[PDB]
Amino acid sequence: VPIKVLHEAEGHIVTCETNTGEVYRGKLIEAEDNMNCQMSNITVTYRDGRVAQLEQVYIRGSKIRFLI
Amino acid sequence: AHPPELKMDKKLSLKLNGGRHVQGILRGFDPFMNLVIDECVEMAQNNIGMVVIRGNSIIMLEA
Amino acid sequence: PVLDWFYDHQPLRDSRKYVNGSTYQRWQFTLPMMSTLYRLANQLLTDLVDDNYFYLFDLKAFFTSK
Amino acid sequence: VQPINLIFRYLQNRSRIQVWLYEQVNMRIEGCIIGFDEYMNLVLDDAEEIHSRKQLGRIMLKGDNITLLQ
Amino acid sequence: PNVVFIKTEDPDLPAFYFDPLINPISHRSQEPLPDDDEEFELPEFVEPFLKDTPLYTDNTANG
Amino acid sequence: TKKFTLMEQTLPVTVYEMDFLADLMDNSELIRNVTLCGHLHHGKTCFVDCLIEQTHPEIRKRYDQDLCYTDILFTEQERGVGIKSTPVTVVLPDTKGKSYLFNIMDTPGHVNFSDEVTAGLRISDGVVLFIDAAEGVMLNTERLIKHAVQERLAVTVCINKIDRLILELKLPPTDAYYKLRHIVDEVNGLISMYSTDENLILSPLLGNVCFSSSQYSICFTLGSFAKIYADTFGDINYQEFAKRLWGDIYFNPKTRKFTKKAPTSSSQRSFVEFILEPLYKILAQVVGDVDTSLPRTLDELGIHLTKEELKLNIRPLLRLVCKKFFGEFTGFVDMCVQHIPSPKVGAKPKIEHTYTGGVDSDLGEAMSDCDPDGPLMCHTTKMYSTDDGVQFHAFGRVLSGTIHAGQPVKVLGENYTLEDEEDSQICTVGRLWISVARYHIEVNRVPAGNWVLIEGVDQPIVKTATITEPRGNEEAQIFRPLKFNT
Amino acid sequence: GPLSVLTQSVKNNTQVLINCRNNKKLLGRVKAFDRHCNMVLENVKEMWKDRYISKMFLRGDSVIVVLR
Amino acid sequence: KLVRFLMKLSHETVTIELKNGTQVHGTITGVDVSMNTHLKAVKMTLKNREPVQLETLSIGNNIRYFILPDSLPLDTLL
Amino acid sequence: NPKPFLNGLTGKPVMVKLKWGMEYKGYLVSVDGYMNMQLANTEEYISGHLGEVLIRCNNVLYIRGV
Amino acid sequence: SSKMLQHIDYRMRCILQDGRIFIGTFKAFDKHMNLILCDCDEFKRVLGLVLLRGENLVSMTVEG
Numbered sequence A: 001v002p003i004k005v006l007h008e009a010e011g012h013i014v015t016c017e018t019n020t021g022e023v024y025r026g027k028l029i030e031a032e033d034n035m036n037c038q039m040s041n042i043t044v045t046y047r048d049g050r051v052a053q054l055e056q057v058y059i060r061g062s063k064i065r066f067l068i
Numbered sequence B: 001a002h003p004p005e006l007k008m009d010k011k012l013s014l015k016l017n018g019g020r021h022v023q024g025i026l027r028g029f030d031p032f033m034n035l036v037i038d039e040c041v042e043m044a045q046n047n048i049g050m051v052v053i054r055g056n057s058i059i060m061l062e063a
Numbered sequence C: 001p002v003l004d005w006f007y008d009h010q011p012l013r014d015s016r017k018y019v020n021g022s023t024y025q026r027w028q029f030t031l032p033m034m035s036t037l038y039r040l041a042n043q044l045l046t047d048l049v050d051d052n053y054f055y056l057f058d059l060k061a062f063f064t065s066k
Numbered sequence D: 001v002q003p004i005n006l007i008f009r010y011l012q013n014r015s016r017i018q019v020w021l022y023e024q025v026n027m028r029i030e031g032c033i034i035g036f037d038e039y040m041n042l043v044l045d046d047a048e049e050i051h052s053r054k055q056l057g058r059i060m061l062k063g064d065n066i067t068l069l070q
Numbered sequence E: 001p002n003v004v005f006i007k008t009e010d011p012d013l014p015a016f017y018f019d020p021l022i023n024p025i026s027h028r029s030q031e032p033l034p035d036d037d038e039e040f041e042l043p044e045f046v047e048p049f050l051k052d053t054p055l056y057t058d059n060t061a062n063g
Numbered sequence F: 001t002k003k004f005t006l007m008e009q010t011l012p013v014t015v016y017e018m019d020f021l022a023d024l025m026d027n028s029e030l031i032r033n034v035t036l037c038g039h040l041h042h043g044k045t046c047f048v049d050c051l052i053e054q055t056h057p058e059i060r061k062r063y064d065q066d067l068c069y070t071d072i073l074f075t076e077q078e079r080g081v082g083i084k085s086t087p088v089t090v091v092l093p094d095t096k097g098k099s100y101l102f103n104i105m106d107t108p109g110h111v112n113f114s115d116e117v118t119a120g121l122r123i124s125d126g127v128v129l130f131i132d133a134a135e136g137v138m139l140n141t142e143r144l145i146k147h148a149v150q151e152r153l154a155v156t157v158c159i160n161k162i163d164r165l166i167l168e169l170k171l172p173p174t175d176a177y178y179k180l181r182h183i184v185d186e187v188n189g190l191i192s193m194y195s196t197d198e199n200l201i202l203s204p205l206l207g208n209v210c211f212s213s214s215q216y217s218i219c220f221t222l223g224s225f226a227k228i229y230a231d232t233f234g235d236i237n238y239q240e241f242a243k244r245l246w247g248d249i250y251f252n253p254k255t256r257k258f259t260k261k262a263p264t265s266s267s268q269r270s271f272v273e274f275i276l277e278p279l280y281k282i283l284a285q286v287v288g289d290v291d292t293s294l295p296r297t298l299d300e301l302g303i304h305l306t307k308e309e310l311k312l313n314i315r316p317l318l319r320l321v322c323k324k325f326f327g328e329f330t331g332f333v334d335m336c337v338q339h340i341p342s343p344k345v346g347a348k349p350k351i352e353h354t355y356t357g358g359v360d361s362d363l364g365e366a367m368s369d370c371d372p373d374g375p376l377m378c379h380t381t382k383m384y385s386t387d388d389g390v391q392f393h394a395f396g397r398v399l400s401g402t403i404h405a406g407q408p409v410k411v412l413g414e415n416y417t418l419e420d421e422e423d424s425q426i427c428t429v430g431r432l433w434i435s436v437a438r439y440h441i442e443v444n445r446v447p448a449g450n451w452v453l454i455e456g457v458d459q460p461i462v463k464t465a466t467i468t469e470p471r472g473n474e475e476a477q478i479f480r481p482l483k484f485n486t
Numbered sequence G: 001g002p003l004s005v006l007t008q009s010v011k012n013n014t015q016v017l018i019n020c021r022n023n024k025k026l027l028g029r030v031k032a033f034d035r036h037c038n039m040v041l042e043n044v045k046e047m048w049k050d051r052y053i054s055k056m057f058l059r060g061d062s063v064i065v066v067l068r
Numbered sequence H: 001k002l003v004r005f006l007m008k009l010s011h012e013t014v015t016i017e018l019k020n021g022t023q024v025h026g027t028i029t030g031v032d033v034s035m036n037t038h039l040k041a042v043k044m045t046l047k048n049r050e051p052v053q054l055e056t057l058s059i060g061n062n063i064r065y066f067i068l069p070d071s072l073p074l075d076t077l078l
Numbered sequence I: 001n002p003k004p005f006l007n008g009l010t011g012k013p014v015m016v017k018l019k020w021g022m023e024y025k026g027y028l029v030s031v032d033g034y035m036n037m038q039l040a041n042t043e044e045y046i047s048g049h050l051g052e053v054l055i056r057c058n059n060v061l062y063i064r065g066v
Numbered sequence J: 001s002s003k004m005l006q007h008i009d010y011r012m013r014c015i016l017q018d019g020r021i022f023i024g025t026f027k028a029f030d031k032h033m034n035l036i037l038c039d040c041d042e043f044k045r046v047l048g049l050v051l052l053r054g055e056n057l058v059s060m061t062v063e064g
């Protein structure tokens, strides 16, 4: 039921942790086969806590390990 | 193996694996997440006009 | 399937897919003509299907009786 | 523009194009290109393997070993 | 063990057929069944093994 | 010479090695202790013959007459009936290929020797009950169901001689399903009438019911035959298919889905359409169309046979075709793995029902851990004779400890208690044998939870006895004598 | 194919040394191979000092090179 | 072949080393067709630290090397 | 496809550089379809020459075909 | 795809590929080892319900 939980999380803003170690929070619009989702309002800390803003970010599923 | 879920003919940046990045206009996607970039400016800005990026090193692209 | 060769002296000796040759030692048959032969030999054959008819009427019982 | 047509145009042009190793800036491939396979496997012809570059002839590179080629 | 073998007379009957000489079964408390159409639909091109093969031929009763 | 032997001179190939059996000797989690039991002439001995021919490569059944491996007495050969129960220790693979040690206690099916079966019910942990499909439930099957419930053992049922529904009775396959379901319902009704516990219910969906033909080498559960479809088509998951096969589930090929309601009239169930009807078509193609459509049918099943194998008679050729199709016997092994517990797991109700000191005594928990180290508690019930008939060998399982050859050891009889010490008598151990029916394997150390022949303890023992350490002994009680059914 | 069978015959008749991608060189009798290049070796000493192991199964993703 | 031997040796206590340097020694309870396995009574040694006892540990293909036990004949699975 | 390049590399010398900086040059014996190659009489460094060696499917960053 | 049955309701401790350790009660898992766990407390933070990919989970251990 994880795919239905991921499909039910659309339209909201959630945070996630990168596989390198970074953390980013944003709101997704579309999802891909390999979890290469497109999201906006990305508050990218750039793996050091320095907050930066991004929009319409399409990040592959290999970069982000799990939600946070 | 499919194309990305974002289709594109607009100025956007893309940080690759290892910390490298490009900034240019997208031309198209591939099944192995390979992208074609026109006027790719390096964000680390050298350009060669046309750039081909494989999806194995592709990490995160943002507008 | 037995109509051609039923009354020969050596029935299928000339054929090669049925007998081994003219020494006429081994034979391999097919099931429809085997069922035909089984139907044709109905008068000289038993009606029993198991040896339970020969309970005290078989060879070991007769050896014990002797 | 799909990357297959761009790869075919780069193979037909056979120009010196700088290609970086897969998240590895210590090795760069910039030189003449001889052929490309269906799974993006490349065979070169005396390309520059810049660290310092030293062309030798036939060099085989994997499809996922290329990070950015321009 | 008793050979309960039924001899058939007419060849018009099927080779596998409930004879009147056999006593009827007359079968008259729940089974651990899965949920109805919850999941597990069968994929394409799977089948019983001998679907195109008929159940019995004319030589089956003779054999 | 006294030729009561039927004894092999040398050991066979047996596929695996003896040191692998010695490595699997000591695990006590991959080992199952199984009594095969049922009515007279229900194919238990032929089932052990199929397991032996699967295991032993150079041992083959003759074409005309049935081999009988466990019937080693010449009285059983002349009479044609089982008389004395025989143990066989074998290594068997499951559907997943994991090897398991199996202690199979082939028992006579005549009710007058039914006490012999109870001796096996002292030693084993699980019961496999054989029922003929044509005969149905008989007197000794009901009596052994009652005795297996009252001895508190796991019960699984295989239905042998299903070919008698096909070749002998010529039933339609829906009526064959009705007969099999009637047999399963009668056995479940007998168990529910006898057992106060309702946790155990026999069903093919739960993996409790096998289907077999021991003269044609057919043995399958639903999981093994769904594994046969899984090897034919790798897309499916065979566990959900085995859950969806039996019990009035219908298949819609338009939706490709299994429903509890029949989609059309004259639509068979999933067990009839997927299992029984290809078996009917295989046996009909062999016995009726051996020269016309048999190689086409064998090519549809992926089975290739040589030219000399197609020249065989109908019964050995059908046995060869079913052996090539179903392969090795794996559904029965998976039944005994996932429905008969280990000696480590199932040791506690055995010591609860058997030991007079009970599990509350300290040696009760010493035996309840099934430890190969510590006290040496063994229980010998059955006794076998040699070829000359001079001396006897005791046979029994080891509940705790290890036995060594040459080790002095104490035997305690039935009249032994904590104040009467005249039943105690001390002997050495000559040799230790792993007992396959026609050859014995010399071993040195036998751990707990495993069956063993003891040589040299035959003097102070009458019927059964308990075997204990002579020095370092304690207040060791006696296992209960065998309460017989008759 | 046949080269892998010859390598398995050499590892049965002698000691084969395989250097994995995790900077470990294991010398021993390699018993079994796999389609995913997984190697099962018997009585293998792995140096990364050489530590001895009875039976070692390694996936082919972590392997790098092998020789007789 | 090697996966068949890993499924066949899924009873005795074995030691599995991950790619991250984590080594866990315990009794294998269930091993799937992939490299995912379940172990019990695992005396798992931490990465350059002390070991801890885990009741049930489940491991994708992150394990690099696995130390199979000595119960392996020449034709047990060959 | 590198199938013809693998077929033409039989009995010929080539060099391969690993991802860990190990370059080995020698006569190629056989190469699999997933670029799993085995060689013979190869000299390696990262080392020396040992004879016949094999490589993994993707253990080499670049292979310099001699 | 088989470890989700034994840990259907019990809480578990998960180790991600980034070195993070979390504790939470798993609810369901996908066929590609994408496991959904509620009340995933970061080790000190709280994240609640979160879904982890198959390649993300380096190792797992049973907590509850």
Ligand SMILES: Nc1nc2c(ncn2[C@@H]2O[C@H](COP(=O)(O)OP(=O)(O)OP(=O)(O)O)[C@@H](O)[C@H]2O)c(=O)[nH]1
Binding pocket: E001, F039, F040, F041, F042, F043, F044, F045, F046, F066, F080, F081, F082, F083, F107, F108, F109, F110, F160, F161, F162, F163, F164, F212, F213, F214, F215, F216
């Ligand atoms: N039709 C058919 N007959 C079988 C099958 N298996 C065994 N039989 C016959 O059943 C007879 C009796 O079975 P046995 O081999 O003596 O084994 P059993 O049932 O344990 O008999 P006891 O040892 O006396 O208890 C054998 O002689 C076989 O001819 C079978 O699968 N199909």
Ligand SMILES: [Mg+2]
Binding pocket: F041, F043, F044, F045, F046, F081, F082
């Ligand atoms: Mg018998």
